[PDB]
Symmetry: C6
Subunit: 218 residues, 6 copies
Amino acid sequence: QAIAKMRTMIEGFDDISHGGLPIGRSTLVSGTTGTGKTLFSIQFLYNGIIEFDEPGVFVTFEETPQDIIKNARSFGWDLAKLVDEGKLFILDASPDPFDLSALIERINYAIQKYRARRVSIDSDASSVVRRELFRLVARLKQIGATTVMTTERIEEYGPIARYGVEEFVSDNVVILRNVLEGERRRRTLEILKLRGTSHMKGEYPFTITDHGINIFPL
Amino acid sequence: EHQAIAKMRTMIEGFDDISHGGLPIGRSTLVSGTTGTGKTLFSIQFLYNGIIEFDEPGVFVTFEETPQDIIKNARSFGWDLAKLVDEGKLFILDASPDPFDLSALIERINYAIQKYRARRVSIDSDASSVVRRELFRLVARLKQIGATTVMTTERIEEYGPIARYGVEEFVSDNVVILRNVLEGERRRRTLEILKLRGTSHMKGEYPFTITDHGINIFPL
Amino acid sequence: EHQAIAKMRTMIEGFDDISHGGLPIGRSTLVSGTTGTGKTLFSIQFLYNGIIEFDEPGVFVTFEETPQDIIKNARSFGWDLAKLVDEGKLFILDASPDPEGFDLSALIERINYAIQKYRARRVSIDSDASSVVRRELFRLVARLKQIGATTVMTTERIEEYGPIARYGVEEFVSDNVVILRNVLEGERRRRTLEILKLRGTSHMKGEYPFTITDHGINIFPL
Amino acid sequence: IAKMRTMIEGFDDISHGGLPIGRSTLVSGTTGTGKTLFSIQFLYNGIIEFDEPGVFVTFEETPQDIIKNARSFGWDLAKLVDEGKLFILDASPDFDLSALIERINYAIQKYRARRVSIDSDASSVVRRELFRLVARLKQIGATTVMTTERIEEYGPIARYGVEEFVSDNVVILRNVLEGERRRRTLEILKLRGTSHMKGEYPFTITDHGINIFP
Amino acid sequence: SEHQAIAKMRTMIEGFDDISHGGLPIGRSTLVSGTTGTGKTLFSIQFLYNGIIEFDEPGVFVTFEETPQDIIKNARSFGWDLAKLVDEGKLFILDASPFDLSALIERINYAIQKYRARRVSIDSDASSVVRRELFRLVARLKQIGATTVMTTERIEEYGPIARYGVEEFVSDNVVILRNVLEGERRRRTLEILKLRGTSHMKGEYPFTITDHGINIFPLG
Amino acid sequence: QAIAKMRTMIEGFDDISHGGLPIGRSTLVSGTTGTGKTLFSIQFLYNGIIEFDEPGVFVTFEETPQDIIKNARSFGWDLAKLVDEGKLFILDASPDPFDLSALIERINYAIQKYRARRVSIDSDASSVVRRELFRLVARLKQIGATTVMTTERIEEYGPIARYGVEEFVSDNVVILRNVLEGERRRRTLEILKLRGTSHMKGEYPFTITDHGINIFPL
Ligand SMILES: Nc1ncnc2c1ncn2[C@@H]1O[C@H](COP(=O)(O)OP(=O)(O)OP(O)(O)=S)[C@@H](O)[C@H]1O
Ligand SMILES: Nc1ncnc2c1ncn2[C@@H]1O[C@H](COP(=O)(O)OP(=O)(O)OP(O)(O)=S)[C@@H](O)[C@H]1O
Ligand SMILES: Nc1ncnc2c1ncn2[C@@H]1O[C@H](COP(=O)(O)OP(=O)(O)OP(O)(O)=S)[C@@H](O)[C@H]1O
Ligand SMILES: Nc1ncnc2c1ncn2[C@@H]1O[C@H](COP(=O)(O)OP(=O)(O)OP(O)(O)=S)[C@@H](O)[C@H]1O
Ligand SMILES: Nc1ncnc2c1ncn2[C@@H]1O[C@H](COP(=O)(O)OP(=O)(O)OP(O)(O)=S)[C@@H](O)[C@H]1O
Ligand SMILES: Nc1ncnc2c1ncn2[C@@H]1O[C@H](COP(=O)(O)OP(=O)(O)OP(O)(O)=S)[C@@H](O)[C@H]1O
Ligand SMILES: [Cl-]
Ligand SMILES: [Cl-]
Ligand SMILES: [Cl-]
Ligand SMILES: [Cl-]
Ligand SMILES: [Cl-]
Ligand SMILES: [Cl-]
Ligand SMILES: [Mg+2]
Ligand SMILES: [Mg+2]
Ligand SMILES: [Mg+2]
Ligand SMILES: [Mg+2]
Ligand SMILES: [Mg+2]
Ligand SMILES: [Mg+2]
């Protein structure tokens, strides 16, 4: 009766997570700029829809839906079609040039409307942050969503996220790195923690290509 | 004559060897570590093994993880915590926030210790001043009850401060550090008994793994 | 058309190769660097080449260097910016402070007038709570995108291998990020350029050495 | 200058005869480095070997735990308290610096103590509050060990960056992690007015207390 | 050399005019930053002194802490008689030593016009406030047509260029003097980090301070 | 008329300083705890008296005069006698159970009362720290005193003094270090800066012995 996992179908990931993302829980995906956070959270939804007909909700706070859709064309994915078919909903919480309760109600309404099984959320007292994140995680779990939530960090081998508390209130933590060494960049993915279940340890190299994320062996 | 500090066995593989007999009885042991280092696991094993091996009841006090998730996650190791709660040998005390007062918490814990006649307690998990003073009080109250207690704390660097506020180790009788060090793209888990007041213990870091059977520590 | 984002050529030696075709069109690219790394040079060369090679007018927004000093220094690279200004192909908008809070909303409208007046396709913008910086930069980026400009915006940083920019937020609201470095190794300096991020498209990774010459930036073959 | 023997194995050699009489010695270390043990041993040996009574001042650890913990070294502190040779001054919680000082003075006069151990914002305030404490202990004639906390092995002497500059004598206890192993060392950094061995010397804590190897 | 966009005046400081490809950009300010005792005041004085001796270009020296008497006294280390130059009206030392920047600027202007000065040396809360006033001072000297050396302090050999993290960004030109300690020995170097509108040699170049002032040794 | 120097007679130092301390100015002597700052400043005055019959004034802010005397006995220096003879004056500015201009009054008075040619002063707004040190330096200069003033620092290879401003208002700067080499300590002396005059550069090893500071220029 240990926790079950949901397949990401992201090449390499379901192997190192031994089955995918823990179902009904949130996974924090943290990374410096341009590490593949949005791509991971899109590929999660896109594969849910295409492979399993599991509808998805994508929550954006800054990037517009138009740009998310445009950028996904880089990978040969037609997100506008999936939205039009009612398989995907891009929920725009991005500011026009905060009430967590209101946001949570909108996410819940969208999940019910689209019968969504997968959610991606992308992306000043740390006591405040800790409390609010806790509440968001709790509410998504109550709803039954399996969720990817991305977060920013500014150092490759420093704090997991910005406020030093995000990981401690997350059930699952994944870290994307983009390490510069000898003038070259190397992308890696690490599953740091999955509460109540197993996973491979340490950094695994990956690339972003025309196909999305590809994760490779040691 | 040399009168030794009594210890109670954790029965966590390898730990009773490193600690020269287990955790000092009637005192609190701080168990600190970065995220996913096995803090909750250690604190659950402590109670579980007490009940299963020694019929010593336990109280688990949780501040963030819900009891249902604690129970769910324990299934990963083949442990049936709901059954122990049903038999009244384990009490999970839910101090979660529903999505300040310490005295109330203490009486609640005291009540539970009395009701379930628990010998073992696990507690999971602004200024330097208040945290030092508040933690000092909690240690003192638990000691007056006679509980042997594991209390977990967070830290954010493997080789930095022992806990978050830089004072927690100084008001703790006993300090254990769980590390998860990243080197050359690989992770290595270690456990270190840093301090046990009034008694002996092995020194330095000892590697461990987490598997289907929980924590397994290797000397070395 | 339902195609991945297209690019406009900078014609800066080597850069269009590293970026696989140039800067993403209709978007802003952050160009960050310590002092004297070539930020202003990169911003100007982007506009200059647009005008000379493609007859695409440019607007240069300066916040500290006077237009006269911008024009004077650009002669170092064989470029006659006064001539381009006279012909109405280049407009320098002087937002530099009085030698004798800042309304970014108002400035944006004036930038838009200039873009409209000069029919500009390329824009360069040459350089305290971080939440305020994030929101203001976000709004500027959005407004330029709405206008349809392809924009270079420079920012400052103080360490070669530290934060991308001053407030730790600038790169996260930028679609594109380029880092110019000037690394001191064994008493010598080595200039490098890195495209760190281009949302929605491919680019070469890591650092590429370059020099500044009498013809501007020259990024070496790799 | 006249020194008083600690009789802590190896320490009197390192200090070239012991701790200068009538003066204060800071003993700083990270957690579990042996600060309390050093403090206790200093008083214990003074009583047992030289019939020099002692006062132990504790701010957090209770008297009963101090006594209990000392029992494992085979040291019967309760017996010494009963004989009036040791007084443990409980300043534990459940300012005034001056109120405490007057109580320290009173116990010293009462028990005829020659040895004192004191077991553990603005630098400005701390520096002259500590200077005040040190100055007065001197006037009384006590020879004092004052422990302080630090959070890094190689880094500031003590928490507030001034403690060492008002102390006559400074001792640092370290617990350094090399690879995955811990090694304890003691260093006399400073002894005003006299010579001493320099640098770090390894020690162990065993059933008989601190054992240092020069 | 001839094919460069910015006219320069020669410091006549041995080796500097080579590294700067002709000297300091005329009518602009050059920041000279360095830790303590790196040669900042010496460079500033040598600039004015050589201007007077070589080209009969009068100079103004603005001091904010060192007294004129001590600046004169210390310059005798190099066999320079600054009192004689002050007597002859070729040098003016403006004593601003113990903010009203406007009043200061007017004093500097009056002295420049009074002494017909061509060369100026200035020696030496929020970053934003420092940035804007520095920007203003630079702009005013530029309007006047002065060629200015302005020294600033820094506290690390390989850290920030100056104290407030903004000074280099509002300067047209930036020079860093270092005094690097390595293996118990000090070695002095000079670097021209930036000269807007022109080329210059890059990196660090060795120099010494002797009885003849600064001697820089360029290479390449 | 380059600035002249007065001999310290401290073994090796007059070589490193090419003649001694600049006359009529202050020299800052900075170092971590127990580096020999008080000892250097005492040896400065003791040698003034013994070698040149130049009286000295010692200004103490922490240590009592009695402790200063006692601590110098291990070097064979009889400061009690020097005080009894009126050749040395120890000015006590310790804590009462900050008017700086009061201090100069007291120092000035002692200087002319004792015919003194040498002075030692031993020993968080960097704003005001800079200004007040600047003022003290200037006042001592107008008196004509040649002064050693000690100051604290907390790292062997970091800031010269505590507030990062002290060296910039000092005419002269000397740094004493006490460095770990393996588990042993090595003491070194550095003359970092003497305005308007020459000096040897870098660190020179020294020891503290029964005859005080002993430096080797090698
Ligand atoms: N077709 C492609 N081939 C290769 N790499 C690509 C392609 N399309 C996009 N990328 C890469 O994907 C990166 C963007 O990844 P994202 O998922 O947008 O990163 P991010 O971590 O979300 O960054 P933010 O949100 O801007 S902080 C770009 O910087 C490119 O390096
Ligand atoms: N069956 C299993 N086999 C191997 N590893 C497991 C298994 N079940 C759980 N784990 C590991 O146990 C870790 C969780 O340990 P916890 O005790 O929950 O950590 P924690 O230190 O309490 O972390 P927090 O509370 O989230 S900061 C997971 O990240 C897994 O790596
Ligand atoms: N003809 C040239 N040949 C070689 N290098 C040159 C030439 N002209 C200018 N430079 C260099 O260009 C640098 C200035 O480039 P900029 O683009 O002004 O840098 P920046 O990053 O904008 O610096 P700021 O704004 O002052 S922080 C100078 O410091 C010189 O090193
Ligand atoms: N009988 C014993 N045998 C071996 N080691 C012992 C024994 N008794 C105590 N210790 C050791 O001594 C340490 C405690 O020393 P203390 O002097 O209490 O440390 P401390 O530096 O005062 O730490 P605090 O006050 O908790 S920060 C324990 O952590 C053990 O490692
Ligand atoms: N006879 C001696 N032989 C060798 N070393 C000695 C002798 N007497 C004193 N010392 C050393 O001199 C040091 C004291 O030097 P001080 O000049 O008092 O140091 P300090 O830098 O003033 O330190 P403060 O003021 O306490 S921060 C002692 O720590 C001893 O190491
Ligand atoms: N005749 C000389 N021979 C050799 N070196 C000398 C001579 N005269 C002075 N110096 C050196 O020049 C240094 C003084 O240089 P300055 O120009 O005064 O430094 P600075 O950078 O202005 O320092 P400040 O203002 O005190 S932070 C001294 O520390 C000596 O090392
Ligand atoms: Cl890639
Ligand atoms: Cl493991
Ligand atoms: Cl170059
Ligand atoms: Cl030990
Ligand atoms: Cl030199
Ligand atoms: Cl020595
Ligand atoms: Mg993104
Ligand atoms: Mg846990
Ligand atoms: Mg620029
Ligand atoms: Mg203790
Ligand atoms: Mg100077
Ligand atoms: Mg001293």
